[PDB]
Each structure stands twice: as structure tokens, then as C-alpha cells.
Design a protein around this ligand. Structure first.
Ligand SMILES: [Mg+2]
Ligand SMILES: [Mg+2]
Ligand SMILES: [Mg+2]
Ligand SMILES: [Mg+2]
Ligand SMILES: [Mg+2]
Ligand SMILES: [Mg+2]
Ligand SMILES: [Mg+2]
Ligand SMILES: [Mg+2]
Ligand SMILES: [Mg+2]
Ligand SMILES: [Mg+2]
Ligand SMILES: [Mg+2]
Ligand SMILES: [Mg+2]
Ligand SMILES: [Mg+2]
Ligand SMILES: [Mg+2]
Ligand SMILES: [Mg+2]
Ligand SMILES: [Mg+2]
Ligand SMILES: [Mg+2]
Ligand SMILES: [Mg+2]
Ligand SMILES: [Mg+2]
Ligand SMILES: [Mg+2]
Ligand SMILES: [Mg+2]
Ligand SMILES: [Mg+2]
Ligand SMILES: [Mg+2]
Ligand SMILES: [Mg+2]
Ligand SMILES: [Mg+2]
Ligand SMILES: [Mg+2]
Ligand SMILES: [Mg+2]
Ligand SMILES: [Mg+2]
Ligand SMILES: [Mg+2]
Ligand SMILES: [Mg+2]
Ligand SMILES: [Mg+2]
Ligand SMILES: [Mg+2]
Ligand SMILES: [Mg+2]
Ligand SMILES: [Mg+2]
Ligand SMILES: [Mg+2]
Ligand SMILES: [Mg+2]
Ligand SMILES: [Mg+2]
Ligand SMILES: [Mg+2]
Ligand SMILES: [Mg+2]
Ligand SMILES: [Mg+2]
Ligand SMILES: [Mg+2]
Ligand SMILES: [Mg+2]
Ligand SMILES: [Mg+2]
Ligand SMILES: [Mg+2]
Ligand SMILES: [Mg+2]
Ligand SMILES: [Mg+2]
Ligand SMILES: [Mg+2]
Ligand SMILES: [Mg+2]
Ligand SMILES: [Mg+2]
Ligand SMILES: [Mg+2]
Ligand SMILES: [Mg+2]
Ligand SMILES: [Mg+2]
Ligand SMILES: [Mg+2]
Ligand SMILES: [Mg+2]
Ligand SMILES: [Mg+2]
Ligand SMILES: [Mg+2]
Ligand SMILES: [Mg+2]
Ligand SMILES: [Mg+2]
Ligand SMILES: [Mg+2]
Ligand SMILES: [Mg+2]
Ligand SMILES: [Mg+2]
Ligand SMILES: [Mg+2]
Ligand SMILES: [Mg+2]
Ligand SMILES: [Mg+2]
Ligand SMILES: [Mg+2]
Ligand SMILES: [Mg+2]
Ligand SMILES: [Mg+2]
Ligand SMILES: [Mg+2]
Ligand SMILES: [Mg+2]
Ligand SMILES: [Mg+2]
Ligand SMILES: [Mg+2]
Ligand SMILES: [Mg+2]
Ligand SMILES: [Mg+2]
Ligand SMILES: [Mg+2]
Ligand SMILES: [Mg+2]
Ligand SMILES: [Mg+2]
Ligand SMILES: [Mg+2]
Ligand SMILES: [Mg+2]
Lengths: 134, 74, 50, 62, 159, 86
RNA sequence: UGGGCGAGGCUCCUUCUGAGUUCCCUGGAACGGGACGCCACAGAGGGUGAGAGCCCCGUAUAGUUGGAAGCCAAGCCUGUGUAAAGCUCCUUCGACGAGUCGAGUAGUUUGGGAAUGCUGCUCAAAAUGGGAGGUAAAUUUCUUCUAAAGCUAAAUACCGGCCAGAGACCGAUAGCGCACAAGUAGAGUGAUCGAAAGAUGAAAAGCACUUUGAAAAGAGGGUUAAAUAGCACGUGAAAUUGUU
RNA sequence: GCGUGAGCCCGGGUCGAACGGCCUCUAGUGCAGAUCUUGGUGGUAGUAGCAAAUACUUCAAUGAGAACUUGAAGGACCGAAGUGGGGAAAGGUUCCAUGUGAACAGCGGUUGGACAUGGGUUAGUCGAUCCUAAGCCAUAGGGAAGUUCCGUUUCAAAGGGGC
RNA sequence: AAACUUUCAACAACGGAUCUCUUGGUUCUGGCAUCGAUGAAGAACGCAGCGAAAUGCGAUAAGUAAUGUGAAUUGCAGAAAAUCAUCGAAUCUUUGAACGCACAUUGCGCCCGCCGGUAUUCCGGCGGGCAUGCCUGUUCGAGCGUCAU
């Protein structure tokens, strides 16, 4: 249950914020879990998804399909996975939009920025665990 | 509560208990105490004898605290 | 008339430039709801007030 | 423009009057209200009794 | 139009009363705001009580003649008899009323005794800690159980 | 009167106002029927709440007034973030 | 009696946050059902292909990473009585607001009644004087203040402005006129007047191709869980109409 | 199927995401009327009608389709106070070229002032601009609680020529 | 007997009710005090690779600087972030209380300075200025209003 006066449990406000969030907020909204191996390696549970990540689909009709994230369409709150596609009437191939929360990240695109992120998350989680274990 | 009122029982009955001949018009007889010395004189004389007129003298700027003396019996 | 002021000529220019159908690629955008130009004006239908 | 304005601010440093575009734009009312020192000025009569009888720090035991 | 045995109606709603209706849906919120303001001002007056010392006063009329209550402030005569300087009284939590007079020795003596008890219970911190003066509490009796509500600790004992 | 008289309608009582832009500037009186130009004060009446709200503040761009709340929130500060190029 | 520090605390910005996507069935898709687990100072809310605490954002808690320095502040360090300031007593003195008060009259206003305030005109003061003391007047007392100059937080009004949180409210003829390129389209010379109008599907996957037709389209065929969901799109009543 | 009844329940079809029973609480709670409001739809009814301005015809081309497109020929009208050639007000792109499904042109339409895509307005000499008219608005002043009214040379210290 | 009319039923039409939904209203509560001659509110006209409108912006024009985040935007094209957040530096057309005089005119002037045309005088280009009421001060003045030599 919410307590803080700054937090609001209004369904209307929550939906408005979600569906009119700017691109930077949509980045955080479109987070995906890490695989078990990456989670053990980095002590990080979830991260915002990025183009060039390798993911495995764990929900929907395309379960168990793996591939590289080729586009993160924030405007449509979906991602595009390599070879996870569909055919139009003309036979032309179009990507299928997958929500990032329906996939798991099996391999991460890592550059100092993507990593300062992981170090911050790991340090925060470790500190919180230590403080709770005091 | 509205569900206990007689208007709910009057639904389906034209004139809502106000009659067909007399029709619940706006203000027959006048507003408030109109016609006290006239068409309403019969009521104002049967009840409230002494409604009209002056009796007694005036006290400008009466301060009620001057007359404070509550009484108790033995 | 042939005699025009610059202000009147400029406003006629603006009306002429606004008198057009909507671009076709607009209707292909995600979340689009514009079907047609709803503010279209014709010289025989609606008189512009100068 | 930024370089020119920085140079102009350096030039007009420690000068009594500087151009309006270089003057700070807070608000009309903010620019018109009394300065801090003028608003805090007090009479000598007030200052004497403020010196000799200020609000004290005190406690009252139960 | 009266129709039966009714009390004669005199409801003053012949103006546009709906234009000036004052509801009070903000009563609990206003109470919360008042409590917050009280807490803030008590914190600001950190060791001091949140109010000023008031004198005992007899209500004016022949009604309420029998009851006493709190007044506005102590008179100059009361302060002089208690030995508290006029300019020093309002700076140590004592309310001063320059326009009230002591027409009776009873009220004068009661208020003087009240002031003397307050002065006996007063703890006066020095203006500068490193050089206390002779009129300040000398740092040893400066620790005691204090009161922050003079309206309760110095109320009307028997109105 | 009627149809035949409507054919003589080829003049203009009102032209475009420079202040409000409406075609309400009386060409002979040279006074705007909407905004009251050229009077200094904008014409506004309390018996037309609709007319008041059609041109009250907020119905236009608010080129300058929309930036005031942010400057107030930050305290009408000046200068640059400690550590800024330039 | 002047100056300067000031631990420490409260602020502010910023980093960070627990737990299943385990097995079986239905389904296009589990977020449904069944089984077995976990977290909970978090089972508020929202999204995700159907009712998700553990898929994601957030949610609880005081903390913490780094930073700016806004406030308060225990206590310290240090000037100094020429000057200035308070108190205790006192013979004496003791300035105090003028076309103002007040009076008459007129108008208005008030609960204010032989006149409550205000204003116009006329008269026009005094020095224990003056005002008031809710019945007009003369006389004699008493009580209470001290007008005709001025400043001043708070408790009070207000949802107009900017933010925020809510509801036994309304649910597209309702709720603001406006859930939409709405004070818009449009009307009027003008002041002004002023609408209608939300919903395919999880995803356009928005029907390739063949055939008939001048074309619009039709018939096959295709997509979809579904096309009698085909942009005249959720459901699809009645009035009214066609065929059987 | 139940109930005297308002109604309640079930079977079948359609459909696609929420909903109901019981006891209390609550109300913007029950429609045939109000020349009721908004919206939709009928009979009338393929009906009234589409009849002022003298009028059309032949061949050919185009086209799916031609009385009202075009070419040629014929027959006619307006008959210089024109159905002619140019302007003022007013309109604003209707002007020109190309193309054209639907809608509009109360019949049709291959045509169009329609729709779509592109073009088009060249000034020392023509106008505005300059002048003053009826008149309007300032100023100095004077009214008005004031929005503002009078005032236009008036009870004003109101300017331009040279070395 | 058909047709026609009517009644009943199935299917198909017409129409948009019903159900369910809701980035919207409405009402209450809490916090805050910040427009403008340093040119506001409002109006006009423009600005995108492909836009008419809405939104945003002002010839630095669907925006520039700066800070933070950290890889998009997306209808197509393109390229090597962003239609991102924040926002303290700037730009900010014609107007508008609107200010050289006007304005139903993109009208007509004057002053200073620079650059050209033979140029203090005319023409052209560029930049900066020229409203009113009032206050303080400055300077130049008027008056037998008045004072001494
Ligand atoms: Mg009956
Ligand atoms: Mg009746
Ligand atoms: Mg009768
Ligand atoms: Mg009756
Ligand atoms: Mg009324
Ligand atoms: Mg005429
Ligand atoms: Mg003017
Ligand atoms: Mg506008
Ligand atoms: Mg979490
Ligand atoms: Mg299955
Ligand atoms: Mg859901
Ligand atoms: Mg399950
Ligand atoms: Mg959930
Ligand atoms: Mg006085
Ligand atoms: Mg008087
Ligand atoms: Mg009097
Ligand atoms: Mg009088
Ligand atoms: Mg009178
Ligand atoms: Mg009056
Ligand atoms: Mg009176
Ligand atoms: Mg008396
Ligand atoms: Mg007294
Ligand atoms: Mg005064
Ligand atoms: Mg006073
Ligand atoms: Mg005052
Ligand atoms: Mg509505
Ligand atoms: Mg509707
Ligand atoms: Mg409406
Ligand atoms: Mg119009
Ligand atoms: Mg619909
Ligand atoms: Mg099928
Ligand atoms: Mg169906
Ligand atoms: Mg369907
Ligand atoms: Mg349907
Ligand atoms: Mg039917
Ligand atoms: Mg559904
Ligand atoms: Mg009702
Ligand atoms: Mg009905
Ligand atoms: Mg009835
Ligand atoms: Mg109707
Ligand atoms: Mg009809
Ligand atoms: Mg016929
Ligand atoms: Mg006829
Ligand atoms: Mg005929
Ligand atoms: Mg004919
Ligand atoms: Mg042919
Ligand atoms: Mg013909
Ligand atoms: Mg003839
Ligand atoms: Mg002839
Ligand atoms: Mg002639
Ligand atoms: Mg011609
Ligand atoms: Mg002609
Ligand atoms: Mg004309
Ligand atoms: Mg043509
Ligand atoms: Mg053609
Ligand atoms: Mg036709
Ligand atoms: Mg046709
Ligand atoms: Mg055609
Ligand atoms: Mg053809
Ligand atoms: Mg056209
Ligand atoms: Mg000429
Ligand atoms: Mg000219
Ligand atoms: Mg002239
Ligand atoms: Mg005038
Ligand atoms: Mg004057
Ligand atoms: Mg029957
Ligand atoms: Mg239909
Ligand atoms: Mg509904
Ligand atoms: Mg500007
Ligand atoms: Mg100027
Ligand atoms: Mg100026
Ligand atoms: Mg002219
Ligand atoms: Mg010249
Ligand atoms: Mg030269
Ligand atoms: Mg020049
Ligand atoms: Mg210039
Ligand atoms: Mg000077
Ligand atoms: Mg002189």
C-alpha cells in the first residue's frame, strides 16, 4: 500500500503517464530481465533493453526464439528481433513487435556506459542487502 | 433517503397526489405571510391571536447581561 | 478587386497556401486520426471575412 | 554572441551603469522592490533598544 | 401561505443566499495545517514556551462577574511591584498591557504573586555563553524539567 | 425590401483590426467593435463570460509568460552550471 | 552593549533497492484453472497478446553513493565604556494634530428609533478642554478614553493562476460548449452566436495472385482465433425495407 | 417454467470480458403522451414536379457510354440603352496548361467557374503615395467619481533664415 | 389461382440503441505567489527533406547554446543519438499598453555615425536614435517679482 503523498494510485493518471511518457522515460519503462547466467555474473536483475542486445523470447507465440535486438521502437513500446518476422500478402517480410518484458536478455551489448550502469546497480543492490542484513 | 419517500409510490400515477382539479400551481394565495389581514385572516385569527399590533414600550440598546439573575428553588 | 492592399494580398496568399489536401504520408503514421482536411475552403462555398 | 556578451560583461564589471540587456532580468516587481540594505535599515532609536533588550533565550521550569 | 397550526416562518432566504454559502469540508485539513504551524513555531522557540505569560483578570459584567480568566497582559504597576523592567518583560515571555489599570489591591497582589512565581521558575540563558552576566542562570541550574505551555502550567487555578 | 435590397450590399462597415485581427474595425468610426482599439484598454465586459474567455490569458501562445514558473521554481537564478563549456 | 567562528542537526540535488516467469490443461496469446515454491516495513497503481506481489516500471523503509552549500545551532575565540542604555527617588515643568470637532439643514444609508455612518452647503470651537456614555432640552455630577498625522506577521477570503492528491460523482444525447486539428468548423456588418464528431485487431498481419468488368466493383483465393472484425471496421436493438 | 402482477429463471442463436444472489446503505432510480428534447425512419411516392428568356439539324472524330464534348456544314437569336469590348465596388485564383474514379453541374456528361498536379500578375511616365473638402483625432486648457467629454487655435513663453 | 395488402418466422438491409471500455470532465482537499516600457497578455505572418491543421518555434524559426541521461528517430528517406529530460546562456519577424508622425498606406519624416556614387546639402546601402505625464539633478534662460553695489 502506498503511503507517500507524492505517489498517486490513480488509474487515469498512471495510464496517461505511461502512454504519454517521453522517450527517456520509455527507455526505463522498456526494461528486460537478464538471464540466470548474466544475473549471477553481474548481480543485476533487470536493465533497460538496447539495440544490439541478444534476447530469447519467453512469452507469446514466438517462445524460445532467440536473436539480436535490431530496433527498439519506443513509439510503439516494442522491440524487433532478428528473424522473428512475418509475411504480408505480397510476401514481403516485416518484423514482429515484441514487448521487452516478454523476453530475457541472454547476451548484453557492453560499453563503458552500459557498464557504469551495471556497476551502479550492483553496488546499490549489495549495499541494500548489507543494510538489511545488519 | 429517496427510496422511502412517497414520490416513488406516485410513479405511474398522473398528478403525483396533487389532484386533477387543483393542479399544484406555483403560489396560490401568495408567498410567505401574504394576506394576513385578508384571505389568510381566518387562520391568523384561529391560531396566533395577537399577531398584529404593538404592545408595550421600547428599550433601545438592550444589554441582556443587566438582567442576568437565574433562580433556584429551595 | 484588382486594387488590393498589401495586407489583403498577404491574407489571400495565406488562404491560398492553406487550401490544399493533407499529405498522403501523414495517414501512415502510428496513431494517426486525420482522414482529410477538415478546414478546406472553396471560393464558391464559404466566404472568408477579408 | 556568447563570446561578445562575456567580453561585454567583463568590460562593464565594476561600472555603475551597464546596458539593459546585460542587466539581470528577474521580474518587474522584483527589480522594483527595495534593496536588502534599505529594507533592513532601522532607526537609531530602534537600534539602541534592540542592542540593549533583544529577545532572550529562556526556559521556564515546570 | 399558512395552512395549519404552524409557527410563523421567518427563514431569511429571500436574498441570493446560495451565492454566499460557506461549507466546511476543509475542517480536518485546516486542523492539520494548524497543528503543523504549531509544531513549527514550537520548534523555532526551541527551549522557550510556545506562549506568553498572562495575568488573571475578572470578567466585566454583572453576568460573568463571578469568574476569572486570562487577560491580555500585565500592567506597569504589576511589573514594577514584581521588580521586572518594562523593556525586559516582553523579551522573557511576559505579556505587557499598558492600558489596563489596577483599581484593586486584590487583583494587583494576585498578579504580582503570579509574576514572582514566574520569575522564580525562569531560566535565563546568557546572551553569550563564554561570558555570562550576574542576571543569568549560571549554567548549573540550567538543566531542569521545563514546561512549553504556560497556558496550562500557569492557568486559572480556580475561575 | 428583402431580396432586392440585399443586392445593394457591396460596401464594408468593418475592416480588419490591427490589434485583435477580427473584421470588427468600424471603417468610419475607426474603432474596433471587439477589442476597443485604439483605446489603450482592451474592451471587456462582465456580462459576457464567453467573450471574456475567448480572449483571456492562455488562449494564445504565451511566448513569455509560460517560462516564468520554471524561472521562479529555480529562483530566477543567473549564471551557468558549475562546470559548463563556453 | 561590539565583532568572528562554529561542531552538530534540519534542508536541497544526485546513485541504489524483495521475490517464479518451475511443471501440467485450455487458449492465437495465461495474466485463467491445477500442482509446487518464494518475497512482503513492498498484496497502491499501471503495462505486458485474458483477473500477474515474485515478467517490467513503480510501490515500503529508513538508509546509502557523490555534490552544492540554503538555514538553525550547543559551545568556543576576541574587543570595551569616552559613548550609549535600563532601574530607584524627586520640588518643578510637562509642548499633544482647525474650515477640524461640534451645530443646523439636505440627500443617502443603517437595526440605530427628535436623526447610525457618509457627503454637499451654512455657521464655526475650546483648554481639565474635547468626544462618547443608543430619547429631544437646561442645570449639576460621574465614568471612560484622548480625534482631526503614520507603519505593522498571524489566525481570515479565494481552486482565478501554477503544481499535487483524492471521490459511495458522470460515463460519449452523460460529464465543461469542447474525451477528437473546440471556443474549432460554420452563421452574423457587428456586438456576439456556436456545433457534430471516441472504440478494427494482440499484432496491419489493412487481402498477394487468378478471373469478369470501361470503371466502381464482383467471383475465387489469401491474413487472422475470428472478416457477418475489411478503414461504410467491437457488440449491433427498434422504427423502416428486401427475399424466402 | 414460476408469479395475480410489476417481474424472475431456463433452452437455442449471436457475441466477446466482465457479472450476479442475499442483508444493510445510497440516489441524477422505473415513460406513450408534455404542438416534449436529440437522433433516426416511414406512408404520401417513383407522386408534385424538372413548361419565362423563339431552336435546333446532318456528317465525322473521341469515348464503355454523346441531345446538352469537339470539328465542319446548315438553320437561328442577341441586333450596338447588345447575349459585344473594357472598368469601379465585391470576390480571391474562379485565369492558363495537363489529367480525371467518386461527389457537384435538381437529365446525361468524354465536358466544367468541379476535382487533382503544375504554372501565371514585370511601371520614374497607369494608380496609390502628395494636396485639401465635408468630417475625424491630437495638443493648450476646461469639465467629469471615472470609462472619458468639450476643445482644433481656442485665457499657450507653441517657429525659421543667414554668416 | 396469382398479384396486392396484412400477420407470423428465418436470413439479408437501414440505423446506431444496448453492453463493456475511457490519456476527458466535475467536485473536494493540500502546497505555492511568479505578468509587463529589460516591452506583457493578445493578434498577424512565416519556419520541417517530404505538412494543410494541431503542437512547437522566430530569418540562429518543428529550433541554437549549456547540463543530465546514455543509442535512437521512425510514415518514407537520410545520418552518425534523441520530436529525450532539465534548463541558469542566447536568438526572438510585423505588431500590440506600443513610443518619430501615421496606418483602410508594408505611407511620410528628422538626428548621429559609417560605406559608395565627384558631395555637410542630393541619391543608395548599413547601424544606432527621435512618444507622453511626472520626480531628482544638470545646464541654458525669462520676468522693474525682487536684493546690494
Ligand atoms: Mg388513484
Ligand atoms: Mg394535471
Ligand atoms: Mg376550481
Ligand atoms: Mg389547491
Ligand atoms: Mg433570482
Ligand atoms: Mg444604396
Ligand atoms: Mg495611440
Ligand atoms: Mg488564438
Ligand atoms: Mg524492483
Ligand atoms: Mg496449448
Ligand atoms: Mg489486463
Ligand atoms: Mg495459472
Ligand atoms: Mg500488475
Ligand atoms: Mg493626537
Ligand atoms: Mg465636519
Ligand atoms: Mg455627531
Ligand atoms: Mg452635515
Ligand atoms: Mg438627512
Ligand atoms: Mg448611493
Ligand atoms: Mg441620517
Ligand atoms: Mg443614557
Ligand atoms: Mg477601564
Ligand atoms: Mg492619525
Ligand atoms: Mg492612530
Ligand atoms: Mg494601514
Ligand atoms: Mg458532450
Ligand atoms: Mg453518438
Ligand atoms: Mg455539446
Ligand atoms: Mg462570419
Ligand atoms: Mg463504434
Ligand atoms: Mg476465412
Ligand atoms: Mg457477427
Ligand atoms: Mg466481430
Ligand atoms: Mg459492427
Ligand atoms: Mg425490425
Ligand atoms: Mg477483448
Ligand atoms: Mg429522473
Ligand atoms: Mg418515448
Ligand atoms: Mg401518462
Ligand atoms: Mg424530430
Ligand atoms: Mg419526411
Ligand atoms: Mg409526373
Ligand atoms: Mg411549372
Ligand atoms: Mg418538358
Ligand atoms: Mg424556353
Ligand atoms: Mg468509336
Ligand atoms: Mg440544346
Ligand atoms: Mg426579338
Ligand atoms: Mg434578329
Ligand atoms: Mg450611350
Ligand atoms: Mg471580355
Ligand atoms: Mg462588360
Ligand atoms: Mg471603397
Ligand atoms: Mg478555365
Ligand atoms: Mg479535359
Ligand atoms: Mg445531374
Ligand atoms: Mg451522372
Ligand atoms: Mg465526369
Ligand atoms: Mg473517356
Ligand atoms: Mg479548384
Ligand atoms: Mg500619374
Ligand atoms: Mg510615395
Ligand atoms: Mg500636410
Ligand atoms: Mg476630442
Ligand atoms: Mg484638462
Ligand atoms: Mg394476433
Ligand atoms: Mg448499418
Ligand atoms: Mg455506453
Ligand atoms: Mg518582443
Ligand atoms: Mg523611442
Ligand atoms: Mg522611449
Ligand atoms: Mg490615403
Ligand atoms: Mg526626402
Ligand atoms: Mg562619398
Ligand atoms: Mg544616407
Ligand atoms: Mg534607421
Ligand atoms: Mg546637462
Ligand atoms: Mg533674469
Amino acid at each position: 500500500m502506498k503511503v507517500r503523498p507524492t505517489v498517486s494510485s490513480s488509474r487515469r493518471k498512471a495510464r496517461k503517464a505511461h502512454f504519454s511518457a517521453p522517450s527517456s522515460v520509455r527507455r526505463v519503462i522498456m526494461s528486460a530481465p537478464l538471464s540466470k547466467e548474466l544475473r549471477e555474473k553481474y548481480n543485476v536483475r533487470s536493465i533497460p533493453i538496447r539495440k544490439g542486445d541478444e534476447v530469447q523470447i519467453v512469452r507469446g507465440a514466438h517462445k524460445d526464439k532467440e536473436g539480436k535486438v535490431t530496433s527498439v521502437y519506443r513509439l510503439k513500446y516494442v522491440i524487433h528481433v532478428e528473424r522473428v518476422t512475418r509475411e504480408k500478402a505480397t510476401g514481403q517480410t516485416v518484423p514482429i513487435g515484441i514487448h521487452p518484458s516478454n523476453v530475457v536478455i541472454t547476451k548484453l551489448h557492453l560499453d563503458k556506459d552500459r557498464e557504469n550502469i551495471l556497476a551502479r546497480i550492483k553496488a546499490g543492490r549489495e549495499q541494500v542487502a548489507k543494510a538489511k542484513g545488519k | 433517503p429517496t427510496r422511502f419517500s412517497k414520490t416513488r409510490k406516485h410513479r405511474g400515477h398522473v398528478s403525483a397526489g396533487k389532484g386533477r382539479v387543483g393542479k399544484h400551481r406555483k403560489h396560490p394565495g401568495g408567498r410567505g405571510m401574504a394576506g394576513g389581514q385578508h384571505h389568510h385572516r381566518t387562520n391568523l385569527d384561529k391560531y396566533h391571536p395577537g399577531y398584529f399590533g404593538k404592545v408595550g414600550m421600547r428599550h433601545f440598546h438592550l444589554l441582556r447581561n443587566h438582567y442576568w439573575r437565574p433562580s433556584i428553588n429551595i | 478587386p484588382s486594387h488590393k492592399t498589401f495586407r489583403i494580398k498577404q491574407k489571400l496568399a495565406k488562404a491560398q497556401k492553406q487550401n490544399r489536401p493533407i499529405p498522403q504520408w501523414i495517414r501512415l503514421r502510428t496513431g494517426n486520426t486525420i482522414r482529410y482536411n477538415a478546414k478546406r475552403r472553396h471560393w464558391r462555398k464559404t466566404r472568408l471575412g477579408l | 554572441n556568447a563570446k561578445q556578451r562575456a567580453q561585454l560583461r567583463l568590460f562593464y564589471k565594476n561600472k555603475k551603469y551597464l546596458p539593459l540587456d546585460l542587466r539581470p532580468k528577474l521580474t518587474r516587481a522584483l527589480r522594483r522592490r527595495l534593496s536588502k540594505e534599505d529594507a533592513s535599515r532601522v532607526l537609531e532609536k530602534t537600534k539602541k533598544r534592540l542592542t540593549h533588550f533583544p529577545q532572550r533565550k529562556y526556559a521556564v521550569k515546570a | 401561505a399558512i395552512k395549519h397550526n404552524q409557527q410563523i416562518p421567518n427563514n431569511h432566504f429571500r436574498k441570493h443566499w446560495q451565492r454566499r454559502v460557506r461549507c466546511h469540508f476543509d475542517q480536518p485539513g485546516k486542523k492539520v495545517t494548524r497543528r503543523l504551524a504549531r509544531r513549527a513555531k514550537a520548534a523555532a522557540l526551541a527551549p522557550r514556551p510556545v506562549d506568553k505569560l498572562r495575568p488573571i483578570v475578572r470578567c466585566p459584567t454583572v453576568k460573568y462577574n463571578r469568574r476569572t480568566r486570562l487577560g491580555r497582559g500585565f500592567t506597569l504597576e504589576e511589573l514594577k511591584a514584581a521588580g521586572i523592567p518594562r523593556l525586559l518583560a516582553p523579551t522573557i515571555g511576559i505579556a505587557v498591557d499598558h492600558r489596563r489599570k489596577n483599581l484593586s489591591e486584590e487583583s494587583l497582589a494576585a498578579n504580582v504573586q503570579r509574576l514572582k512565581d514566574y520569575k522564580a521558575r525562569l531560566i535565563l540563558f546568557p546572551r553569550k555563553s563564554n561570558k555570562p552576566k550576574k542576571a543569568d542562570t549560571p549554567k548549573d541550574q540550567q538543566t531542569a524539567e521545563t514546561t512549553t505551555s504556560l497556558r496550562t502550567s500557569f492557568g486559572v487555578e480556580q475561575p | 425590401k428583402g431580396t432586392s435590397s440585399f443586392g445593394k450590399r457591396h460596401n464594408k462597415t468593418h475592416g480588419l483590426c490591427r490589434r485583435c485581427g477580427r473584421r470588427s474595425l468600424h471603417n468610419q468610426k475607426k474603432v474596433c467593435a471587439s477589442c476597443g482599439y485604439p483605446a489603450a484598454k482592451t474592451r471587456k465586459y462582465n456580462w459576457s463570460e464567453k467573450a471574456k474567455r475567448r480572449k483571456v490569458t492562455g488562449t494564445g501562445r504565451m511566448r513569455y509568460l509560460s517560462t516564468v514558473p520554471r524561472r521562479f521554481k529555480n529562483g530566477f537564478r543567473t549564471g551557468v552550471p558549475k562546470g559548463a563549456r563556453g
